[PDB]
Amino acid sequence: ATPWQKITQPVPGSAQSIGSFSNGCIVGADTLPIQSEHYQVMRTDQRRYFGHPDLVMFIQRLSSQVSNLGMGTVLIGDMGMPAGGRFNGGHASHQTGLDVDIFLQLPKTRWTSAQLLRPQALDLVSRDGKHVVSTLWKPEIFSLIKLAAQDKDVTRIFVNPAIKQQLCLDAGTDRDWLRKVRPWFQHRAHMHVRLRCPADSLECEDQPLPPSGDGCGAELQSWFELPPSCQALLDEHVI
Amino acid sequence: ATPWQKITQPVPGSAQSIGSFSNGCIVGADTLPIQSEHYQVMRTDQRRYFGHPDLVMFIQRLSSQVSNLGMGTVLIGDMGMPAGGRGHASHQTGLDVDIFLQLPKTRWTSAQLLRPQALDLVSRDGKHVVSTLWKPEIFSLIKLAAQDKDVTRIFVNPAIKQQLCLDAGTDRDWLRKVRPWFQHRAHMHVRLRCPADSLECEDQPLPPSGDGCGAELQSWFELPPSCQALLD
Numbered sequence A: 001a002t003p004w005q006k007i008t009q010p011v012p013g014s015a016q017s018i019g020s021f022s023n024g025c026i027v028g029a030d031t032l033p034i035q036s037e038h039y040q041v042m043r044t045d046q047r048r049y050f051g052h053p054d055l056v057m058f059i060q061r062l063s064s065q066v067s068n069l070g071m072g073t074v075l076i077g078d079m080g081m082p083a084g085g086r087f088n089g090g091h092a093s094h095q096t097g098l099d100v101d102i103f104l105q106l107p108k109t110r111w112t113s114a115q116l117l118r119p120q121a122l123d124l125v126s127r128d129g130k131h132v133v134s135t136l137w138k139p140e141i142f143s144l145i146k147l148a149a150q151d152k153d154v155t156r157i158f159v160n161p162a163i164k165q166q167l168c169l170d171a172g173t174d175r176d177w178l179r180k181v182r183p184w185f186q187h188r189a190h191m192h193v194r195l196r197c198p199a200d201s202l203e204c205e206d207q208p209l210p211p212s213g214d215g216c217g218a219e220l221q222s223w224f225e226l227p228p229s230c231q232a233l234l235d236e237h238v239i
Numbered sequence B: 001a002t003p004w005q006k007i008t009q010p011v012p013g014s015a016q017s018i019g020s021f022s023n024g025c026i027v028g029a030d031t032l033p034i035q036s037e038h039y040q041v042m043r044t045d046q047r048r049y050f051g052h053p054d055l056v057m058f059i060q061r062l063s064s065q066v067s068n069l070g071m072g073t074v075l076i077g078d079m080g081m082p083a084g085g086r087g088h089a090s091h092q093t094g095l096d097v098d099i100f101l102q103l104p105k106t107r108w109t110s111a112q113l114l115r116p117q118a119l120d121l122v123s124r125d126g127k128h129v130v131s132t133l134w135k136p137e138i139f140s141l142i143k144l145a146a147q148d149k150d151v152t153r154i155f156v157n158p159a160i161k162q163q164l165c166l167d168a169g170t171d172r173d174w175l176r177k178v179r180p181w182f183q184h185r186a187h188m189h190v191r192l193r194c195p196a197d198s199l200e201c202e203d204q205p206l207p208p209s210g211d212g213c214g215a216e217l218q219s220w221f222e223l224p225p226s227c228q229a230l231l232d
C-alpha cells in the first residue's frame, strides 16, 4: 500500500543506503542480473531483487565461489525493493539494500522459471524445532553458510536456532565464524545475510558487533525453550 | 547366582585388576568409605561400592574438587562387586564407576540413597536434554571428570554429549573422552586406565580423534583362568 511497495524502478542517483536495516531506504539501488552461471533468482514476481552495489557484488562473489567448488547453483531470495522500504509481507528488515535471503538448497541442475517463480520450500528444521532433519541436511549447506560467514563484508547471518545448532556441532576447531551466525524465528529454509554499511554511505546506521564467543551455549539454548532523507523522497513525490 | 554375586568380602592381598572391563575380576579390592563430606553412596544394599584403590582415590579427588567449587554433593552409583565380575556390562575389574548426573546441595537421607529417583535428563524423542533439568554444574561435573588424567572414557547418552558439544566453546579437547552409548540418561559411566602394576589388566585403544561431535555423534540419532580360580 506504500509508495515503496508500488514503485517499479529504482530512484536514479549515487548508490546510497539510508537509515537502518529495519527503517530506511536506498537511492540508486542496483539490479541483480537475472541470468548468471553461478546463481538463479527466485520469486522475481515480487520485484525484490534490487539492492546496494555491495549486496549485488557479494552475491556474485559468493555464487562464483560455490560454483568453483562444484557445490551447485545459488538460489537468491528476497533482497530489497526498487527503493528499499518495509516489505508488505516477509522479513522485517531488507530496507536499505544490504540484506539478502538465500535458499538453503544448492541445486546441481539449474531450476526452470516455473520452479523459481514458485519455489518449493525445503523445511530443514525438525518438527519440534530443536534439530535439523538429518535426511535433508547436506554437507554443502554447512559449507554455504560458513563461506558466507567468512566474507569480511558480512556482519550477521540469521538462521533458525536448530540450524545454528547443527552448525555448532559440525564446526570442530574452526569456529570463530559462528559468532556471525545469529538465531531467530523461522528462517527454516533461508539464511538471512546482512552486510556492513558501505564505506561511502554517510546516512547509513551500523549495528554493534554480536556477542562474543561461538554463541553455541546458553544464548542458543534460550531459543530451545523514517529518516528525513527518505521521507523527503515521499514529501516530494520521487517514489 | 554366580559366585561373584554372593561373595561379601573383597579377596585380601595386593590390589590387582585382572582381565578386561567386561570380563575379569579383582583381587585386593578397596572399599569406598560410606561416610564422606563430599559424596554420598547410592544403593549400598547391592554391595557394589568396591573397586581398585585407584578408583576410590579418583572418586575422592573428584568429589573434593566438586565440593570446593560449591557445586554440590556427588552421588556414587555402581562401582564393582567385592571381587569384581559380571545393570551395565563392564564394572568387572573395579575400574568403572557410575555417577548420578545430579548434585544435590542438601545431603540426601538414607532412604533416598537406598531408593534413588533416577532423573531422566534426556528428552522423550532422545535428541536433546530437558532444558529445565540440565544445570551448569552437570556440565562442569562431566568436564572435571574427563579432565582427570586417570580417566580414559566417560559414557553418556548421545543427547548429553550433544549438549556438552554446544556448551564446550573453545576448551573442548576433553570431549574426545566422552562417548555416546545407549541409556545413561541418568548416569555418566567413568572408566579409568589400567593401573600400572596390574600386569594382567587389559586396556582399550584410544578413542577416535577429534571431539566426535560430528558424523559419529549424529549416527546415534537415527573367563580369565586367575579369575576362575577365585571362584575356587
Ligand SMILES: [Zn+2]
Pocket (backbone or CB within 6 Å): A078, A091, A094, A099, A100, A101, A192, A193
Ligand atoms: Zn531476510
Ligand SMILES: [Zn+2]
Pocket (backbone or CB within 6 Å): A126, A128, A130, A131, B123, B125, B126, B127, B128
Ligand atoms: Zn527433539
Ligand SMILES: [Zn+2]
Pocket (backbone or CB within 6 Å): B078, B088, B091, B096, B097, B098, B189, B190
Ligand atoms: Zn557403568
